Symmetry: D3
Subunit: 243 residues, 6 copies
Amino acid sequence: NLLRHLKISKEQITPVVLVVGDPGRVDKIKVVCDSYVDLAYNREYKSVECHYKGQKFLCVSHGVGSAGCAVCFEELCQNGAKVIIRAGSCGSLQPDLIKRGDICICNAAVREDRVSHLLIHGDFPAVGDFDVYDTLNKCAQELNVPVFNGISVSSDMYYPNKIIPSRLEDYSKANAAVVEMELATLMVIGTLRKVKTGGILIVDGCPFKWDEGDFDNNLVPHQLENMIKIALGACAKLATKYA
Amino acid sequence: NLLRHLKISKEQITPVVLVVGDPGRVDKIKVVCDSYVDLAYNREYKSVECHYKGQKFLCVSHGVGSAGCAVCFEELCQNGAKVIIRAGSCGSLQPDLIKRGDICICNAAVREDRVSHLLIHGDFPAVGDFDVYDTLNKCAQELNVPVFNGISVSSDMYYPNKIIPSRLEDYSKANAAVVEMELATLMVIGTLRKVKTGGILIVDGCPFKWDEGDFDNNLVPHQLENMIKIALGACAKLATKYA
Amino acid sequence: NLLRHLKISKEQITPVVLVVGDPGRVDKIKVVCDSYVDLAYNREYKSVECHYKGQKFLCVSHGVGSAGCAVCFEELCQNGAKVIIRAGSCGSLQPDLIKRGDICICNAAVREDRVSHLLIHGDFPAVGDFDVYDTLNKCAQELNVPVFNGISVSSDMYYPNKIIPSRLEDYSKANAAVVEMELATLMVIGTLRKVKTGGILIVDGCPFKWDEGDFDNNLVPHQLENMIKIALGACAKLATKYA
Amino acid sequence: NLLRHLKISKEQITPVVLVVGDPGRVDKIKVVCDSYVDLAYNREYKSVECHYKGQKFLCVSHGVGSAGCAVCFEELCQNGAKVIIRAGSCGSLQPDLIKRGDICICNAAVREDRVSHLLIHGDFPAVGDFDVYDTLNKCAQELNVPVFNGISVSSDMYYPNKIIPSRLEDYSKANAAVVEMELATLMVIGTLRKVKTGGILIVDGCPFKWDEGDFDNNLVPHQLENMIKIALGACAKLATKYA
Amino acid sequence: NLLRHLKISKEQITPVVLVVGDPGRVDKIKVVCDSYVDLAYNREYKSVECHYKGQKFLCVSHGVGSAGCAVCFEELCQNGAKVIIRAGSCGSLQPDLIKRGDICICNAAVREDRVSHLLIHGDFPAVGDFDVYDTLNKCAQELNVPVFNGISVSSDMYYPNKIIPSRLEDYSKANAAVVEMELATLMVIGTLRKVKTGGILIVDGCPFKWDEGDFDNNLVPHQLENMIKIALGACAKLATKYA
Amino acid sequence: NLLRHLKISKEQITPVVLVVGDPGRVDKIKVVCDSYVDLAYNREYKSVECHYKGQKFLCVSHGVGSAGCAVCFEELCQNGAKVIIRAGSCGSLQPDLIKRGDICICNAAVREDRVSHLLIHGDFPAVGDFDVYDTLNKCAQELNVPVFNGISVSSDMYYPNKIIPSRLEDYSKANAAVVEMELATLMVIGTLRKVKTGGILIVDGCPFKWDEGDFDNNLVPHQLENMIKIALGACAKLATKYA
Ligand SMILES: O=c1[nH]cnc2c([C@@H]3N[C@H](CO)[C@@H](O)[C@H]3O)c[nH]c12
Ligand SMILES: O=c1[nH]cnc2c([C@@H]3N[C@H](CO)[C@@H](O)[C@H]3O)c[nH]c12
Ligand SMILES: O=c1[nH]cnc2c([C@@H]3N[C@H](CO)[C@@H](O)[C@H]3O)c[nH]c12
Ligand SMILES: O=c1[nH]cnc2c([C@@H]3N[C@H](CO)[C@@H](O)[C@H]3O)c[nH]c12
Ligand SMILES: O=c1[nH]cnc2c([C@@H]3N[C@H](CO)[C@@H](O)[C@H]3O)c[nH]c12
Ligand SMILES: O=c1[nH]cnc2c([C@@H]3N[C@H](CO)[C@@H](O)[C@H]3O)c[nH]c12
């Protein structure tokens, strides 16, 4: 009995799961683990069992956008997942403080999607699990990797238009740290399904300055590597609790 | 230079574009053409230039979900595309009429997403271009493939919960024929960007009966084949004009 | 029995109905038909059975405003009407392309009313029927009357204030062609009551330039006549199929 | 210059105006006054200068519907009107207390329309003038005509459907006394334009019991006569004050 | 048994109740009456029975804010109160007309709170009881104390931020006269619970000019005294009837 | 000068502040500290400087309700406060797990208020600070006091009615642990003003079971005492960071 989109089975899902947007990232991550086992690759959902520091945990891609990652999260959550951490890139909403290559560990997010709203009233908060957040921060510390912490704007609109103003500036003034497209959806589904969520992101630019060239098409190896070591370090530590 | 996510160039975009959800479908579609030229494959976005009936039109996958597909559509719309037709699967909202395997050509959709709303007020209608819609029907007729016509509910939620009621039943009563996850976004973006759009779908089940086993993990072969034939034919005809 | 406001009987309703706003316009139309038969006149609703090219179809006024025209359309749709085509005036939202006298056939509208929302969720599209739209266009073609095609903004507010800004500018940018006050309501009511709908309009000005005198109290004589011909033609053709 | 819809000049507008919905009603009232002067009749808007008790004031019909009567009310408010009292019919939302033929003078109203919201935020109250309200109740008293007082639900939807529940039950529980289609609109435009407003209504049924036949196509003759005298009386008193 | 927050029994509640925000204002009021009886003091809720002009009635403080006062109004309304009149301070939204020290008797309010919305749909009006409104204006007249009349904006936000614009300017244009923090909540709860409400306020500054020093930490003494006399006077006339 | 409502000077505000609902409660708290200094008592806002474990910090009452507490929180945040911890009571939304007397430390909340929405869009999350959250949890551990952790629903409605359904059952299903009236307001204002917030609460009942007598008028003594020690110890620890 395979999951509609993940195409893996309930028994293949581990208590801890690391999710990334791009299926290509999963290939690049598994290779940095001690060992790995490919499980499946359907549509944009690539699943690979990872082995790191004596721990077992999956790495599944969820694709771009909230609606699509929700399919992934729901299938994981409703079939055994206990801890889901997202690792990806984001834009800066505090250009004078957080810049390209920087890593931010988010504890909550703005719900600028639709799926979470079709799941629960807008007043409900999109908040991650403290423990996942704390473990991600401690691993960063142990790897002597400096990081930022804050709220992420999870917006379904990457390319804004000139009719309806973007709420990015409002949220910047509101002290939101960064902007991406999945975290809020992950957090809300997680709390509704009693699954611990977290999120660590690396900055690839600032949407306020895209027209100025404030955007990297590719991340600096060293930096991306650091964020991955943190994420993997965290999953390993969190998985130990369910071994 | 390449487009951020598609990874192709402005010159590589044909005036007509056939968009699908699964990147694997693009492969299964390219082979059935006279000849093709693989262009790129980034994340869930595979771009192949198709050759059919002496015409040139691209076949691009947009992934699952509106936020992710809007990324695809915006990059196409803002870089040359004059016509975009979505071909994918959907669910039936009229079980006593539309069953598994049936094909439906839609001309309008329910905007149960968030990205379109971040673009223009919700009162704005998500409607396809008439000619595209008509062209799709004439091809279905020439090929002698009976099809339905109607409104598709484009919802960002695939797996509903037990707290906030789904609006599928209401829309069913409102006479909406089908339910999927991207059309409404395509139409709205098309209208704003002045790009003609249309959509044709093949039913894979009925969400009101998933619990009773009404769902196909695999689309009906001959029906899928006919739909793709209709789509390719329609794309070929429309492409002709622009050439 | 008689319908509450139209004061006509169910048996007096023809499958095809032509609806106008001003009841004084229903008299001007009946006189250009081969023959007619006055049915009733209550409040702002004047009903007449028109005879044209061997076909019989009613011509009913619906008054200004969505709420009032809804009362008229509900009684028509719930008592026999199968097709309803609205013919009236509108303002241009594209002053550089669409000017006074011009005629526009719309296939969708912006739901800036309240009745449609009291009837169905705001995400539902206000879209007219394909055949009706096609018919109107072909009839315009045969008469060699050049017409525009696009979305209409149906707003309950004719006279804007200075507190809450008008959304017309946004819709103009979103590529909506014109603006009037009843099309969206007709469309939604029809989709709900399985009644084919459509609309054709003649421009009497541009709300963006009213203060500059850009507005006609009287419609362009010949242009109005052409629209009426197109309308009567489409009714005749549609009434034939139903008979 | 004539108003766009009313087709009367600015100098033809008296400080006090009595508005009814049916243009036929304006004729049946003018004859009950000492004398009168027919001013104009365009669309559903018929205007007549009434002479009663040595005082002068217009009687203009507004048609069925919030959007329609708004065009009327705006043209009057922006051109002289200081006081506008609406007298029409309504349904009871309190079947055990308010019944057919009963008269209700309303001080406030539920804004279930769209134009008011396009004018100011929904939080703003639809409330009439205390003095107008007061003069109406006193004219009723001097005529020994018992009347009810309360809130009117002004809803753009006359014929409800079975998808989106009607809020009428809710408002009945909230103690709204009556239901009609124009009062809230008049009150909001009025406070915004600094025009005093009020309304008197006669009950023709109870929408909760329409299916049982709790409705009258024709109002109780004498009861209708009383309400109109109260209205004409109130109008005369206020007009005097404005003399 | 004692009400949860007021800590008084149902038998200690009189048909007429005068509410104020500051519990300190209660002590300053009782000594201006012929006599009094301290009832209770819990949290910000101070109740005292007042004896004025041979009539009995309570004076209860409700604290700052719509949610806190709703708790107060509900315990009073669900346990006997028939009339509740609020007497407090407010800011001016019409600095060209209403100044510090001026008194305003309000008949309706803008519902910029949340409690009233969790009680009834937003379209419902926040309107006071006419008799109460009239009784206050007449007492004012008998005391030769000029007063203003108008709509009050009851907003939950006292200190605006720079991200989301304040709606006060919009409401000033809409002609709202004054702004405070509990009137609309009292009115709505009142209408729902069949309790008659009213409100008399004294201006302590204008929020549009706080940055220019337009604010009084202490209200104009003589003026505050006049308003308190108008209130006690009104409470006496109203309590008289019930007795 | 003094803060408008709290009546204390900017210089009298310490970096860490302990806020509570009942002013009567701050007097009961200062007495358990080493020493204290009364600062002011205006309306429901009582301010006292507390000296505890070699540290200093204020304890201020904010009264019942979000609009009321916001006044308190704004005056504190805009004048030097760096950390604000709310210690209050709450109702349980999980009667089978969390019971009366139990203590719950919250890190996020549902924004069922108006003020926070008047400061920023609803999608913004109401989340507390991690350090504060962890500090409170660590202090609980050291004192060997078991506590629950979870989301609190902050709702402006204490007494619901029968027209509009309460959302409490929904949030119970969405896994929110408890319900109170001011935490979401504090969190939002904190994030906007760059002030670290937190919240610890003691259960006094279950709103789902009030009708069955599931409510304590008096908080469980030893449990209340335990919670206060946790709050005082947390404030002391956090204040150390600013010494
Ligand atoms: O500046 C940005 N805005 C919005 N999303 C992203 C992302 C993340 N990368 C993906 C889009 O490239 C998507 O998954 C999003 O979550 C990186 N930078 C940005
Ligand atoms: O019953 C259905 N509900 C929602 N989406 C789909 C789909 C389409 N397939 C994809 C999800 O498998 C997604 O792209 C969606 O548009 C098929 N059947 C259904
Ligand atoms: O510029 C315009 N704005 C809004 N409505 C109209 C109309 C149509 N005419 C009527 C109002 O005169 C109304 O029925 C509306 O649909 C013409 N021009 C305009
Ligand atoms: O039961 C009712 N519901 C809604 N409107 C009305 C009316 C009034 N009469 C008109 C519709 O016949 C319309 O102007 C409306 O305001 C009478 N009875 C009812
Ligand atoms: O300018 C103002 N804005 C908002 N509220 C008030 C008030 C009233 N005083 C209290 C706040 O100080 C609160 O009860 C409010 O209703 C006085 N002046 C103003
Ligand atoms: O069951 C409950 N619902 C809502 N608030 C509270 C409270 C807290 N107590 C106060 C209301 O009594 C208010 O400050 C609120 O935050 C205790 N129990 C409940």
